[PDB]
Amino acid sequence: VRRGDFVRNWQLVAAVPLFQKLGPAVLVEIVRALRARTVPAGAVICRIGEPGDRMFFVVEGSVSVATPNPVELGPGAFFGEMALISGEPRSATVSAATTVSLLSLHSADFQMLCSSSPEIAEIFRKTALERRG
């Protein structure tokens, strides 16, 4: 973990209220695991039918989930959780509605997060069910 990326992540995680449920020790683990990325408007982040090995948190800007009736997800939202939970391919294509700042979490670290915080794990599980059905 490089200093620059580490320090920058603290500013970025502040835009994701969900992480307010994590104590200091857990926050550090997550900050060390998260990867920051900026995606230009229009780019495809997750493509329907493809294998998924990571999930994302929106920091700034918004993404569009290409469901029959598209769903725009904004700052603080997360996506790409379904493939990690179910093991199934991406359920829908997600693209940048506007230029978007994201924080990504690989599967191994997603598992760590869920075990470190059962409450956050429940939010992921229930939200995925809402989206699934």
Ligand X SMILES: Nc1ncnc2c1ncn2[C@@H]1O[C@@H]2COP(=O)(O)O[C@H]2[C@H]1O
- The smaller minimum CB distance to its own copies, of residues 1 and 68, is found at 1
Stretch that binds its own copies, among 1-9, 48-56, 77-85, 91-99 (CB under 8 A): 1-9
Residue 82 contacts Br ion per CB under 5 A: yes
Work out the burial of residue 17: count CB atoms within 10 Å of its CB; fewer than 13 is exposed, 13-18 middle, 19 or more buried.
exposed
Residue 39 contacts ligand X per CB under 6 A: no
Rounded-to-integer distance, Cα 6 and Cα 30, Å? 10
Rounded-to-integer distance, Cα 128 and Cα 125, Å? 5
Residue 46 contacts ligand X per CB under 6 A: yes
Residue list for the binding site: 80-81, 90-91, 131
